Design a protein around this nucleic acid. Structure first.
Ligand SMILES: [Zn+2]
Lengths: 149, 147, 79, 330, 924
RNA sequence: GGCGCGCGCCAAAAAUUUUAAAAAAAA
RNA sequence: GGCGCGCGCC
């Protein structure tokens, strides 16, 4: 029995050694989760592009912040695959939904290796707030395995 | 029997709330109607229909899959949601104008490039963790699959 | 020695430091004029004149410019 | 526990089997992680297009025109390698992949502060030799360390290129050679060498006099006769002086023109001499042992350099029969 | 131990007469004079002068301390007259040769029975009022000359020159070696610790000594400050003596405003002086080339008149008459007459001797009206002026640059008053942006620095003392005024230890053992924390996390600035400096020119300013990072940064997060894990400790730490007291004796053999090396000119960037000389003596070997003067020193018993002394 | 008037000499 | 560029 718990705790510590990245320091008093709370977490990889455009990326994020603030006065609940950032232990109301990750994308040169996708509005991409519908002809209009539309 | 188990797994997948958020205008899926498989098609859009759901993939075409000797017409096909063999996870960079033939041909070449990059198969989505399905029934089906 | 110097060109070959110094001394106090020494030691097709005061280069330009020396006009430039 | 912990940890799981050749570019880029705030949900496509545009902008400049990129930024010790789910066997290609996959940064941008960690990579431990560092602009006034305050191109001197291809940029009291390196002359007068070289002989008036009287009296020689009346006031709880004897002599401009030399004011362009330019109008306007014990052994002290009062000071004093102090004291 | 008691004597105001005498002897007021005064003076005698004369009457030594412009020399003249009347020989010992010559002229005009004994002239040796430089007196005493047999007085001039730090030792040797019957008259500038010197004399000679101190001057002075950049002059110190703070504040404010953003600057001041009738002025600049530069710039003024020009020409011609033709027509002499004609003169150490003497004469007469001179002119005898201007305020002493000490400022400002002629002197100081109110206030409101000895053993002293019996070097070491000034401090430390011990014994905490254990564990925990902090600050584990927005906490020992946003970092030699953006107070920004940053006081509003720091001073490298504006020049940007820090801090009510050393930094050394485990164990022990869990226990901790501080103080004072009761230089003496005996000079029982006896004579040069070289046979091969050239290596002591090009006749022997120097340096070093061979052998500069060889073969002076870059005055000084050294070398080679080397040195001294370099002074 | 070609000339062209200080003194 | 010298073409 105790051997099992020893193994489990050893494995847990070994894994959490690297889980430090996905660790938000605790004690942060952030009410009004909708506005006050993180925005991104850009894990800069080891590619010369990111290396030399770090400053431009940070400026872009700041510009996004300023643009939204300026045009503020001028929902999309997380999908079932929305993880929460693991707080290190040192009223979770408004600290529960604020640190919820919705979308994890690894950008290669020509294909973004994605996972967790992104949410939408009651299964309605035409109204959701992040989907870019391409332009297509739709010359078939025949359901492959059901009566055509 | 194990075929029934796979059917149950992919019925858990193809449920709306666990597969739709992964259907994005670049999502690289594979679609295969019994006997005939088109290959790899990119999602372009989906919508309801008064309840059933339809996914506009971009597939090679002769609706039937194109022949090996010919070259596919590479057109948008409105398949049903639960005809998808495998919702892989490599979302592509889409041109947003799939009307001209050049864009669709470039998309086909991009899919060929991605295939070339991965020698053995292509990464898929695991319903247990990627989609966050906390259904005990799915756990039982997984256990049956393992045995 | 940047705003107190003046560049000269369009000069006859025999023209040396002494002649240019004598000519430019009239406009204002001239400290030294060096005929540039080519890598062979020969003179060069220009000269530098240094003025004691900073208000002498514009006047030397406005006075000594196009003067016919050795039957040859001289083009003078600031720095 | 472990179920959810591994669900979280798979976010960093890169699938195995990705063949990579040019690791500097055949690899991943920033892995953003959106979150549940409006500023990130609304602008998703903006960020995706921004990263694609970053790739495109790198293509436009680096691949086409400059074609220079050989950075040696190795990851700093706080770097991390993304975990990977094992579906293919480890080999040289997969080790090269692990080299390609190396988180060398991390950030969590809030509205007005980012909880950075892992810092940024380094290049010889100097931001000026780095890539992403940007140094603000400040004063640098103190110049006293708090811990211990008591601390071949000729164009720019650069030993990296040639001057012609470089866009980038007292005296001893007895050494009066400043104005005697080659010779000495005078203003106003015209020397024989100048007469001959200039092409104008004695019978013809000097040419520059025309444009000189067109302009006026030189300021260059006016400053020499300028004893500025330095105005300094003794703060306790300008009538500049002109030396009217050093003015230069300019026949034909201010002084009477030499007789016999024609007035060629119509030739070369000029005007006749003016009253203001005349000299008068303008110039006037301005147990010890005894001594028998120390000396035993060593050579006795001697007198050398014998001399007598030269008397020079007596002669100088006699010469100074009168002087300011001598006159005032008596 | 010293046995001396000091008693004050009732006196009129101004002067403070005191007497230091042996304890056993009792004090009786000195009897009033009887008979006719030795000499009488026309002008009334001031109080202190009268008291000094009275003390001189009763044959009791006296030390006078007063401003040079108060007339000290009247007392010396009275003493000389009194000694001459009784047919008693007297000696007047002066520091420099030039002042010696001036004083000889004055005393010869006065009494007509004087002589001179300097090292380059011997006028009237059999006189009764000899005047000499203290070095020759020391040589006479060591060689036991009978001249000192009948002396009844000795008068030391400017004993404050005893702290010279290079030749301020000969004063102490001469004072010690003199018999007890000869009395002393010491004349010194104003110093605070006069009574200590009087007590030293009393203890050393058993005779009473007297001290007269007067801080009075005849002509009051007004001070002015010129801020470089402003226009006018401000009145900082009024003639009344009080300091006007407001005007100084205004001047420094003008300087700060100007620095925040006639032709020259001294030219304007001199022109203002001329037009305001402050004509006779001395401009003090501390460089050999600033003086010449400022002199040449004034080629537009004219002070004198036609008659004065005639007189100046006459005097200059008469003076230069003594030279030779080609020496008359030198550029240096010719190109200075125009300066003297119109009333300007330059006087520094680089000029020829004749020009310096002539300029001194002309200034004394009054023909010159603006003398640009260094501080060498400040000691001239009775050559004052109506105004003194300080171009600069930073001088290079022997060691390194520094602000002029208040003593030197007082000494130089003392040349700004002429009795009767002008009734108020004016002293003008020109300040710069580097000056800050923390330096100017001290300089204007300071006082003369004390007189502290500079004793230090040397091989010549040791050898000479060993030569003569009935005395040993320990005798000199024990009576050196270093030992006295050390023993005089013991009562202070004794009282200090007594008081600290009583303080220790006063405060008692209610509980001793447990509270002590708690304090010990808490302090050990703090030490472990500091160890972790030092582990963090490693070059490879702290640089990446320091970014232009990084938030850090900075505090130095006992002072904490707090949170600052790292702005930049850089390297230097390795050590790294991180420029952060902290808070500072106005009182710290104002003095920022020459000060280190200081934290602002929270109760008052400060200013956000950039401060450089070292990595060692960073406490916590917080993980948070800020968005830096990228332009931190405006004040508002830095205020916005402060507001951002305020908001960030308020966003973490329990404290900002800190980077975790083990994981976030990425350090995987066992040391960190072990230290963390030890810290965990200690903190758990503290928490479980019965005392710790008890709240309200900070008072006991404060008392315990106070007691620990008292214990540390007691330990320090105890070690001080136990170390301060033995000779402070016996180790140096033993090392020197070891070196002497191993080389071959001394013997087993400290007996001086032939080598040591010979090396006794050679004084000016280096003794051991020269004696060793002569003994081996190095000079037995060189020629006369080569020998003189080589000897020129030991006498040059001036910095020079240029280097020689020695040929195949002067370079050869230089290698052998350097080899012998290396051998001697190694022998000294292995005797546990702190000698660095590189520096020791780098002091034998051969830069003048070629010059001297050329000049010692029939060459002019201009010719050689064109072969170097150093001034001509330095060449003349080196040649004079080489002449005297070659004389001593000739005597030594005679002593050895070898005559050929005597001939060689005689040839050298025949061939190196012809022309102006040895032009006899015109003050004689 | 108009147009074409051999060419001296001044007209106007550039030009623009790259590498850290310091006082005093003697047997 | 034109002073234009010179030759040719319409
Ligand atoms: Zn360059």
């Amino acid at each position: 029995c105790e051997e099992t718990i020893e193994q489990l705790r050893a494995e847990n510590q070994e894994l959490k050694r690297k889980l430090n990245i996905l660790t938000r320091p605790s004690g942060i008093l952030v009410n009004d989760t909708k506005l006050d709370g993180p925005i991104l977490q850009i894990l800069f990889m080891n590619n010369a592009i990111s290396k030399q455009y770090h400053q431009e990326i940070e400026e872009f994020v700041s510009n996004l912040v300023k643009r939204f603030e300026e045009q503020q006065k001028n929902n999309l609940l997380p999908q079932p695959s929305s993880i929460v950032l693991e707080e290190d232990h040192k009223a979770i109301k408004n600290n529960k939904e604020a640190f919820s990750v919705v979308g994890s994308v690894l950008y290669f040169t020509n294909f973004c290796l994605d996972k967790l996708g992104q949410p939408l509005l009651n299964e309605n991409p035409q109204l959701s707030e992040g989907w870019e519908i391409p332009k297509y002809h739709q010359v078939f209009s025949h359901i492959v395995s059901l009566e055509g539309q | 029997q194990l075929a029934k188990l796979g059917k149950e797994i992919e019925e858990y997948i193809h449920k709306p709330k666990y597969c739709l958020p992964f259907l994005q205008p670049g999502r690289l899926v594979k679609v295969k109607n019994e006997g005939d498989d088109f290959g790899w098609g990119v999602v372009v859009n989906f919508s309801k229909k008064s309840p059933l759901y339809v996914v506009e993939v971009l597939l090679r075409c002769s609706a039937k899959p194109a022949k090996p000797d010919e070259k596919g017409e590479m057109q948008v096909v409105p398949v049903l949601v639960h005809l998808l063999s495998a919702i892989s996870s490599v979302r592509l960079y889409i041109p947003k104008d799939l009307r001209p033939v050049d864009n669709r041909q470039s998309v086909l070449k991009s899919i060929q490039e991605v295939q070339k990059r991965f020698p053995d198969g292509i990464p898929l989505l695991d319903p247990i963790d990627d989609m966050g399905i906390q259904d005990q029934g799915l756990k039982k089906v997984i256990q049956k699959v393992e045995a | 020695e940047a705003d107190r110097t003046l560049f000269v060109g369009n000069l006859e070959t025999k023209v040396t430091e002494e002649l240019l110094f004598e000519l430019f001394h009239q406009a204002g106090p001239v400290i030294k004029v060096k005929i540039p020494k080519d890598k062979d030691g020969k003179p060069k097709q220009f000269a530098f004149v240094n003025f004691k005061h900073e208000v002498s280069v514009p006047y030397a330009m406005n006075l000594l410019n196009g003067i016919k020396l050795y039957g040859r006009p001289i083009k003078i430039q600031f720095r | 526990e472990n179920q959810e912990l591994k669900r979280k940890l798979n976010i960093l799981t890169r699938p195995s089997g990705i063949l990579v050749n040019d690791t500097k570019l055949d690899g991943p880029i920033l892995q953003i992680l959106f979150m549940n705030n409006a500023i990130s949900k609304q602008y998703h496509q903006e960020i995706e297009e921004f990263v694609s545009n970053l790739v495109k902008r790198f293509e436009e400049q680096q691949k086409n025109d400059v074609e220079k990129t050989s950075f040696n930024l190795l990851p700093q010790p706080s770097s991390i390698v993304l975990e990977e789910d094992h579906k293919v066997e480890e080999s040289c290609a997969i080790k090269n992949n692990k080299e390609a996959f190396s988180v060398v940064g991390s950030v969590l941008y809030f509205t007005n502060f980012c909880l950075d960690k892992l810092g940024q990579p380094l290049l010889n431990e100097n931001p000026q030799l780095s890539e992403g560092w940007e140094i603000p602009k400040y004063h640098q006034v103190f110049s006293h360390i708090v811990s211990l305050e008591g601390q071949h191109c000729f164009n720019c001197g650069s030993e990296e290129h040639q001057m012609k291809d470089c866009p980038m940029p007292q005296q001893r009291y007895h050494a009066e050679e400043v104005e005697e390196r080659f010779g000495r002359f005078k203003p106003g007068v015209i020397s024989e060498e100048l007469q001959d070289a200039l092409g104008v002989t004695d019978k013809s008036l000097p040419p520059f006099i025309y444009r000189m009287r067109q302009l006026g009296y030189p300021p260059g020689w006016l400053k020499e006769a300028e004893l500025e009346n330095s105005g300094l006031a003794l703060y306790d709880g300008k009538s500049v002086t002109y030396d009217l004897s050093k003015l230069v002599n300019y026949p034909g401009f201010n002084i009477s023109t030499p007789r016999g030399i024609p007035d060629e004011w119509r030739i070369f362009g000029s005007i006749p001499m003016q009253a203001c330019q005349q000299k008068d109008v303008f110039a006037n306007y301005l147990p010890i042992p005894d001594m028998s014990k120390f000396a035993t052994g060593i050579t006795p002290f001697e007198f050398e350099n014998m001399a007598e009062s030269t008397g020079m000071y007596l002669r100088i004093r006699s010469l100074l029969k009168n002087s300011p102090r001598n006159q005032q004291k008596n | 131990m010293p046995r001396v008691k000091v008693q004050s004597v009732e006196t009129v105001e101004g002067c403070t007469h005191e007497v230091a005498l042996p304890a056993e002897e009792d004090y009786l007021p000195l009897k009033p004079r009887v008979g006719k005064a030795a000499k009488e003076y026309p002008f009334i005698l001031d109080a202190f002068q009268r008291e000094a004369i009275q003390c001189v009457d009763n044959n009791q030594s006296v030390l006078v301390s007063a401003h040079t412009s108060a007339g000290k020399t009247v007392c010396a003249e009275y003493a000389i007259a009194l000694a001459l009347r009784e047919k008693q020989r007297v000696i007047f010992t002066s520091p420099i040769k030039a002042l010696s010559n001036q004083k000889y002229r004055e005393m010869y005009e006065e009494f007509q029975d004087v002589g001179l004994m300097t090292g380059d002239v011997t006028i009237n040796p059999t006189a009764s009022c000899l005047v000499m430089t203290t070095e020759i007196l020391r040589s006479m005493l060591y060689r036991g000359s009978e001249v000192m047999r009948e002396v009844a007085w000795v008068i030391f001039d400017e004993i404050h020159y005893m702290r010279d730090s290079e030749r301020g030792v000969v004063w102490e040797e001469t004072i010690i070696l003199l018999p007890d019957n000869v009395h002393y008259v010491f004349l010194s500038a104003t110093i605070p610790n006069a009574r200590q010197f009087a007590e030293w004399i009393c203890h050393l000679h058993k005779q009473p000594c007297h001290v007269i101190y007067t801080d009075y001057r005849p002509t009051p002075l007004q001070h002015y400050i010129f801020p470089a950049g402003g226009d006018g002059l401000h009145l900082v110190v009024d003639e009344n003596g009080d300091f006007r703070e407001d005007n100084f504040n205004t001047a420094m404010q003008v300087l700060r405003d100007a620095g925040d953003l006639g032709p020259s600057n001294v030219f304007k001041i001199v022109k203002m002086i001329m037009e305001r009738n402050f004509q006779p002025v001395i401009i003090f600049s501390f460089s050999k080339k600033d003086c010449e530069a400022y002199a040449l710039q004034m080629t537009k003024l004219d002070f004198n008149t036609d008659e004065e020009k005639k007189m100046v020409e006459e005097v200059f011609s008469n003076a230069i008459d003594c030279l030779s033709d080609e020496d008359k027509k030198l550029p240096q002499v010719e190109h200075v007459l125009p300066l003297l004609k119109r009333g300007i003169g330059i006087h520094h150490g680089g000029l020829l001797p004749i020009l310096k003497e002539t300029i001194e004469i002309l200034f004394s007469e009054g023909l010159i009206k603006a003398l640009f001179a260094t501080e060498t002119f400040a000691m001239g005898i009775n050559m004052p002026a109506r105004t003194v201007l300080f171009t600069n305020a930073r001088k290079f002493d022997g060691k390194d640059f520094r602000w002029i000490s208040s003593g030197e400022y007082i000494q130089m400002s003392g040349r700004a008053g002429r009795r009767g002629m002008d009734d108020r002197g004016i002293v003008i100081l020109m300040v710069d942006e580097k000056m800050s109110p923390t330096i100017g206030k001290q300089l204007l409101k300071g006082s003369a620095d004390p007189l502290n000895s500079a004793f230090h053993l040397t091989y010549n002293m040791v050898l000479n003392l060993l030569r003569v019996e009935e005395i040993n070097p320990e005798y000199m070491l024990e009576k050196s005024f270093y030992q006295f000034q050390h023993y005089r401090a013991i009562p202070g430390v004794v009282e200090k230890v007594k008081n600290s011990e009583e303080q220790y014994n006063k405060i008692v905490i209610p509980n001793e053992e447990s509270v002590v254990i708690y304090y010990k564990i808490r302090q050990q925990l703090a030490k472990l924390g500091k160890e972790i902090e030092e582990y963090i600050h490693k070059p490879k584990y702290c640089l990446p996390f320091l970014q232009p927005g990084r938030l850090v906490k900075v505090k130095n020992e006992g002072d904490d600035f707090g949170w600052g946003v790292v702005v930049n970092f850089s390297k230097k030699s390795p050590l790294y400096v991180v420029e952060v953006l902290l808070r500072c107070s106005k009182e710290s920004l104002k003095n920022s020119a020459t000060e280190a940053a200081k934290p602002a006081k929270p109760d008052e509003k400060g200013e956000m300013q950039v401060v450089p720091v070292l990595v060692h001073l960073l406490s916590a490298i917080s993980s948070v990072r800020l968005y830096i504006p990228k332009d931190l020049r405006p004040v508002d940007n830095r205020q916005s940064v402060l507001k951002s820090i305020q908001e960030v801090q308020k966003r973490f009510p329990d404290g900002i997060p800190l980077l975790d050393p083990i994981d976030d930094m990425g350090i995987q050394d066992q040391g960190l894990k072990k230290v963390i485990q030890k810290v965990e164990a200690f903190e758990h022990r503290m928490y479980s400790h019965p005392l710790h869990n008890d709240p309200n226990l900070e008072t006991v901790y404060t008392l315990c730490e106070k007691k620990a501080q008292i214990a540390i103080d007691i330990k320090s004072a105890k070690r001080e007291l136990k170390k301060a009761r033995t000779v402070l230089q016996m180790d140096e003496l033993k090392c020197r004796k070891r070196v002497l005996r191993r080389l071959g000079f001394a013997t087993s029982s400290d007996v001086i053999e032939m080598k040591g006896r010979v090396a006794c004579e050679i004084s000016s040069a280096d003794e051991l090396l020269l004696t060793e070289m002569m003994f081996n046979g190095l000079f037995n091969d060189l020629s006369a000119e080569q020998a003189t050239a080589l000897l020129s290596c030991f006498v040059f002591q001036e910095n020079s960037s240029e280097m020689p090009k020695l040929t195949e006749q002067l370079a050869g022997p230089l290698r052998q000389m350097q080899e012998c120097a290396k051998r001697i340096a190694k022998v000294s070093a292995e005797a546990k003596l702190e000698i660095d061979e590189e520096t020791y052998l780098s002091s034998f500069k051969p830069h003048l070997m070629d010059v001297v060889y050329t000049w010692a073969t029939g060459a002019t002076f201009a010719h050689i003067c064109k072969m170097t870059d150093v001034f001509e005055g330095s060449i003349i000084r080196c040649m004079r020193r080489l002449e005297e050294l070659l004389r001593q070398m000739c005597q030594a080679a005679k002593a050895i018993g070898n005559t050929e080397l005597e001939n060689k040195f005689a040839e050298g001294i025949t061939k190196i002394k012809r022309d102006i370099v040895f032009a006899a002074s015109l003050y004689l």
